[model samples]
Target: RFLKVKNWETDVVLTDTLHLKSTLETGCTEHICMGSIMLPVRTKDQLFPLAKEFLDQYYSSIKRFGSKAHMDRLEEVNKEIESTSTYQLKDTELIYGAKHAWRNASRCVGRIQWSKLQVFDARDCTTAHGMFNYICNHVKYATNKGNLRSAITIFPQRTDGKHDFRVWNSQLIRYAGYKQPDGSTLGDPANVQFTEICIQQGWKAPRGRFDVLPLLLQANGNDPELFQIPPELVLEVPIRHPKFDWFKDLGLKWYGLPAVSNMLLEIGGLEFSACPFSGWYMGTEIGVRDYCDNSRYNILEEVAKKMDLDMRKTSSLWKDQALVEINIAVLYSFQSDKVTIVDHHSATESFIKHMENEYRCRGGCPADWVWIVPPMSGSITPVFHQEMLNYRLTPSFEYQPDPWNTHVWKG
Candidate 1:
């Protein structure tokens, strides 16, 4: 198995293994970078064989390799697939597979904590209404009134090419982007396209910043239905700097849980298009990117203006100063509100430890260097200097095309 090691100076113990190879390569070669490319989906001519490999892996993981029970299940799956072209997954298998996917998510900085995930099986859900309810419960459970927990709810697998369950919203909770008469944005600018589509679907836009977007759910590939998430179920943190009295005047707020809704979950060669997942936020996600990105809220200039910095002079470094304070405010607000959050510094430190753990166990851990580096303090973070391997690992979440682009809709 695995070896556990501890550094007395650091006072933290972690598990590692030397069983993996010294070097591993997926697709990259010496001359070119292939990290940006996606592996082809195993959707064509890959059902039974892919399923068998996954079953073998599962049995190996459970320490039941080649046992009578494992052998019988393998034969059972083969017979079932031979007749019907597909087989049902046992409930226990579903739970294990979903957790396995989370652990293998290459881009997530939070994977170190994947084993603690709370998985919900909604594979029996057959309607948009039920999807909404199941998702609502998931949000409630994940939020836990701001002490957020990692969770995912898996809806039914795809039935055919056209009749598959899908979530249209990029996130279960997000703000609207309203187009103003003066050609400026009244709300979050990043969501303008999605907000327009919501309007097209007859959603009455409140035209307010930070208005939590409703769920646009498609069940079995029909026209997606819209359902409003109960506002009470969402726990929001109104941002205030621990030291700045004027920060409250900014009227900034964000939802506690970052629940991604649109990605497809691949587990054991099965595609779950309606898998919605939630975990707590990394501070910069809201404080920097959401608040400071020019494409999003664009508030750095505002914060700098309030701070009486030299906004017109590039050497003043007004934007960098504003980002530092915003990052401070987000972490402080989450802590003050008892919401689970991670500071970039602490997160990167933990990620370093995680890298060591995974490398010891899995030969190499696939990481995106561009994303792993902190937005503001790149050089200061440990991951910034480390050369990383990037590869696709499953079961992991994969980005899919926007549902609206492929479907026809009229305003």
Candidate 2:
């Protein structure tokens, strides 16, 4: 179970904001790096400087260009991280949940199931205490009929309500498997050692890269045709030498959620205009040269109208307030190290640094960049879980999330 806090969530109510996707993407990345619920460990004596860097990244240059250069800044973050030492810290308690483990190869492949309980959410000590109590109760009454009373009723669910909620109800058990602690019987009490191992391990995201860009340009006060945006005028990274593959293998599917798959470009199949490596800050205008037919500008005025209404809506108090102060939160379920401290920490550092440089500022939380993230603290209970054992999640300190902050409704 992860704990997350939300600030300035009501900022962009609609999907029509030119930088909507970018905004949310950056929000997710920043939250993971500097949110409160899952508080990131701060630097040693360099706390002030690091904090300054953190603020500048999220607040100052939120949607500015220079992504490549921004990514390059993570190297400096790594150096700083390496200079410090990570203390031996454990979650308050072990969190229990089932997860699947898939094994595949060219010649032969099969998966073996085991209880999918572990301490993946180990970032927050306070929160884990609650989870630990739950998992321990499970072990205490391994086969008691009362244990199965209401498998689904009471548990509070994850943020990704549908996909994540189902993860708890369905996939977790069937795929990850549940086993007796002693490995001698299926219903026996969970062994203490087995539970310890689970707490010490976790899962990870697949080793691959993906990027998405939604550079929209809508002409104002139109004779509709006059609303056209030419390619040359479009602001974007150069198509010939772009960063990661947004239009290629990494499906650049667009969805203003609640409306599945709204708009998209062919994966690696279609070509897009590029942004000049050096240029002034252009809000959301694509030059006149690269605008596509039908796909773009055709109904720009209508779309812009739609977007204006969407962004205008408000939900919570912090919706549009400046994100001056931000915190980092992290949520993870550790099963067999598919996700580990190394992976999580590195990913966090890389993300924080990228954002720091994206928005040029000295350091600390920007007076305009606040955030809330999920927590990673849980109790450690005795349970055996099977996870990706052979090929663990590789570390990548180079990847970065998209830039933009807009409201998003998953359902």
Candidate 3:
């Protein structure tokens, strides 16, 4: 169950409690595992409408810019879906659908260049080894030596009776979280459960808090295969404040890219459960959410104390001050490291331009104000002042069950 708490000042939206059950057919009695947070279940009731919306959009787009042959194929695809319950999409169609899905994503503020996304087709790859090769190539290209490009690598889609190929790693690059005996977490708290699962699967986890977790790939009903990410490919930044000498001593650091895995890529009614997509990090995503969230880093009090702010009084805005400095440090570190990262101010401005462009091109832009607004200094951003209606749009990305839990245990 989830509870919502709201604040008038920041319009702060917080989730009080959320528990996702194990995705395995044989359920876990001891623990709730990490999985899709937004879309917990897939149903025909939810899928049919989204499929219709996607077909409508695809038809409209083809009518405007595509050839007559493409239109004919789409009609066939429509009939196939109606009769057989699933349709096949060509490579070009998949690329266009993925980009449109990104644009329709209500939570993403960085949809302005959605069409520029590089899509890698690995749908034909049926082996774990093949998937690992594609993922490594994807990492190399997306990393781009800190230039950072938004890209996605898609594997096979799931059907009614057949098993699916899946990427078990939550992201192509992520820091491991080791839970200590004292109940303190050593690395990213969000990754501790995943890290534990990896260790159980026989991957050697490093002793450090920030060690990059290896990739886990599964084909069919087989056990997952592990692949270690080469140290040279991952670019991480040692976070330090430009003005504070003490900040260097804090030993804070983070990876350059934010690639999300385990989310199903829904396009024109088909569910590709193994598509991992990524975009460059927005500074607030790192500083405000990843580093400052209470469950994650929980560093506000420590940073505030070092800054000599009065932590005893809530009105002193100590947390707020620490948050701003952390955000500043994130922006500074990324830029200093020659990595691509966008500040909230610039990101908000770009989002405004995106909204306007969508208005001119696609009648209206659908946005969720709660997500579009920056975590820190929400009122000052242009998106905060704008009223938005949250609604469904299709050929979109949706979260799916965790790949690890979805694995069939032969035992």
Candidate 4:
């Protein structure tokens, strides 16, 4: 027997209670998760379309003078991404694989590891918060209050099937733990936490089904469908792929649809992992420097200086000195170089001289050069492989989209 909706005995005028009561009477449960799409839209409306205006005004301007158009786009997104508030919601709408939800009175905290290859995934309360708080405590004890470089790596739990250990729709929140009348285990800090949610039976694999073009124009909303990209002016970003113009070049096949005709969401999934992984690292000035030099990573700099030219004429360097500080980390010698080959005996000075002539010494001064010999007394043996004691940095980063949080149903 279905329960009929009834007016509340105490507060009949409270619309929320009445609405929820009506929902229960009708036996509705599916639509709750679907409403997350509206949350961001509501936020956008309240925030006054920052995403859209940002896209139009900024990106159009960048297009005027630059080489890498796509990179510019990535930079803008990264900035916005850092600033956006993350939420780990539960019960009401959006089953983001979370078994529990933090409430309003809870204290929210989160941490993300930086990776050299890809952006660090969003990590939520269940997997990373404990260690994150520990790291924060370590920093708080120190003079500088710690920093990204000092934090340890705590990845996502493998149990969440969407992308094991990868962040999707990252959010962290804490509310006053709930207590039952008898106070057994409802909100016991140790007892209440996220459980790994297994994938549902026969998960419907995306056939580019998750898209925004049609959904954004849904009948309920009064808003523009287009997602505005930003940077008042941007450089023509060159996307790094086997195929050069994959990001910008239209007419490619995206799930059989013409690439140009498909939305950005569709075009992206084909190239990268749905739950992409980036091994995060601590950020350091030296690390950033090496990354830019070796990997051609992007660095944020205000519009003050151009390559070796005067800053006064260029203007804005002081304001824009941030290095997008993409991926920059040292791969161990065993990984990037061989253990046997990296020893000083095999690393001959003659070989170093040869490499200098070919690569680093081409247009440089001899006065700026210095040599180091590892702790070997006197041996005629040669160093067979060039072992780097420290890291030789070349930085790179790949943009990853949240397959679960992005596409199809808004938010």
Candidate 5:
């Protein structure tokens, strides 16, 4: 069945019939909720119309709608597209659209600071080697010696459904996972497939619990070239607890930047497949998702036992107690290192304020409730109680097909 937002404000859901048709087989049911799943990929048609709509929005925003400059720019774009089949975006247009894309990111809880993102337009890049240089500069600038700033590096746009620029890495900074002969994983298990790909691409795989993976950069639909991220450019903070001395012995560490690559940035009708955007880490992202998840580090039982908590049964609440301490350690370590990070409670609170402001500014504010809710806090968080409407908006970041898929390279 097609989805619907429950009729609180309106009897019908906020979805278009055409858009709804493609989203039906999303593996969702009444009893099962895949609310946290990413939205499906949208179509590639309506290029000129989409472009014109965005142009109008941009002109209107600058109070130049229907003005001579606005009309002339539109004519120039249309004339360029008549022959080239694609139009170039002015630097100002790109900047505006990029910021709005972050603003229109429904699942991101950090949208309150969307306007502050530092955009590095790398559309002129022609080689993977040049891409590495831009990426390294972005990392260094965003990291800012552990004071992480929100930033994005947008590579060249996909031209004529070919010559697409892509970053093969899921994240700019991610740990490699190695499957042992005995069937245990050493690093982040979610990335084992990518880890193997990196190895196949001639990366010198390092055997370690938290080995940083190399960058796989592909420009203009070419073969991906491997480049090692210079160690000095990556800012890492070792985890330690403020109160518990034993916590430091765990030897856990994480990168300061959470720059998610492998996502396509859609602005007007153009798609930049190699756009990598980043912001400071949320404490729960490291503490709960990374450290406590069963598939991840799975350090809960060990930490609980060290605290002498009863681990024999779930009734003992061992998981909850250990999770708190782990989260505390994460917050403490980041603060002690002077690395920028925010706790879930504070982030959620800010998100609530942002929602109110957005609702007042615009009639609609799309949000995926499942993502807006924090991982640790179930009922107490303000977002947990809010009714949210999820819908599509353009000039947004989207999940792209894997770089390994959708294309083949020939010698």
Candidate 6:
């Protein structure tokens, strides 16, 4: 006994709600964060389901190092979280949460050694000055004087409905991008806006292509304070080709450690907005993506010309030759400087071992093939053939809105 509608009327009322449920469930909206399409932050109703998932995983986790009382207490915490939306995790819980988040990171191909991550508890730091101090320590420890180690410095979590602490820099270490009057950038274009923000916050902007940006720390309801990183602490490798002596004269250099700062660390539904973490660079990450990408350095043509490669024909494979040399130079330079860097071949081999270990330990691994595969050589890596899926995982790291976009400087 349903009423029939005319074609025109049917199109008006029926179509809007037709795909509404699917859109809501899948979070189909396009929101870009950290150069990737991010999953929407779950609503309370949506988050409740993930709470259960996290509890099951966390319960098993605590059981390895705690008594039955720990599991029982977490069960109670789970109930409180579901009912009242208030819960707190212990320090051990936070440590494991970060490690698990790294392991579950879909885009990272380097998660095989997640167990070796060093966690720093800085949740007690409440001021911008304290944040700057902790960050200096983080850089020093993570940099490890060329013997890099994976590390994370966790800041206070969001509580009582207030956004408290955050770092404005996308990474603990980044080059300043100074846009010249000629409209060409001198450094990493990815950080041009951040570089300008630093300049506006009383930092002297350096015009060199490899000048490091200072840390911009901000506490809630306060102005950002800039702190310069000590030059001796930051390990930089001057770029020089193994064959071409002239390449060193280009004045190219890069930092040893790749520490990311803009992402939020979500552990057990609590968001730490100011957690910065680091891992050593994979050669192609710098050589291909950062240096060769069109929007960034766009150096392939310049490099090819320097190498006397034919610029006229695509068939010359001149760009390809230049890319390999650049990557080789990066690898060789780091090795010569006694800095840590991994080649794609070795990195993937370790990833494969990690996969086997993960399958034995956790029974499943979620990965994104597009990210797991290196930009230089896709077919050669084992991750390329592997079928992967990207899904929403709890207690994971995610990108938040950039600080400048959300707040105005007070000083």
lDDT of 6: 0.77
lDDT of 6 by residue, 1-411 (tens): 111211231231111111111111223336733324444423456555555456666767756435566567657776776776756677877888999889878688898879899999998897888998898899899888899999999988776434558888888888888888999888899889898888877888758888899998887546778888888888888999998998888778888989999898877667888899998999998899989999898889889989999889999999999999999999999999989999998888788667656645665455566678899887777666655434446568887888778766554
For candidate 3, what is the TM-score?
0.84
- Candidate 3 lDDT over residue span 1-411, tens digit each: 543434354563443221121111212124863222344234444555555555555666767435576556656766666676666677877898888779878789998879899999988888889988898888889989999999999888877524777788888899899999999899899999889988988898776978899998887646788889788988899999999988877789889988888777878667888888888999998899988999988899899999999999999999999999998998999999999999988998898777766655664566667688998899888778765544456667777678656567654
Cα lDDT for residue 347, model 3? 90
What's the TM-score of every candidate structure?
0.90, 0.16, 0.84, 0.18, 0.91, 0.86
Model 6: per-residue Cα lDDT at residue 138: 91
* lDDT string, candidate 5, 78-185, tens digits: 777776778889999999999988887778888899889898989889999999999999999999998788899988888866788889999999999999899999
How are the candidates ranked when ordered by TM-score, highest leading?
5, 1, 6, 3, 4, 2
Alpha-carbon runs more than 4 Å astray in model 2: 1-69, 86-122, 126-411
lDDT of each: 0.82, 0.20, 0.78, 0.22, 0.83, 0.77
Model 2, 149-244: lDDT tens digits are: 111111221112121111011001111112335653221122222222222333221212111111111111111010111222221222110222
Residue 240 in model 3: lDDT:
93
RMSD of 2: 28.3
**Top candidate when judged by TM-score against the true structure:** 5
Question: Model 1 over residues 35-64: C-alpha lDDT tens digits?
Answer: 656553334367777687778878988899
Instruction: Give the range where candidate 3 is weakest over 10 consecutive residues by summed lDDT.
Output: 18-27
Model 5 lDDT on a 0 to 1 scale: 0.83
Candidate 3 collision pairs: none
In model 3, what lDDT does residue 129 have?
A: 91
- Sorting all predicted structures by lDDT, with the top scorer first, yields 5, 1, 3, 6, 4, 2
Residue 61, model 2, lDDT? 37
Q: Local error of candidate 6 at 52, Å?
A: 5.5
Number of the predicted model whose lDDT against the real structure is largest: 5
Which regions of candidate 3 are displaced past 4 Å? 1-56, 62-71, 75-85
Question: What is the lDDT for 66 in model 5?
Answer: 100
Clashing pairs in 5: none
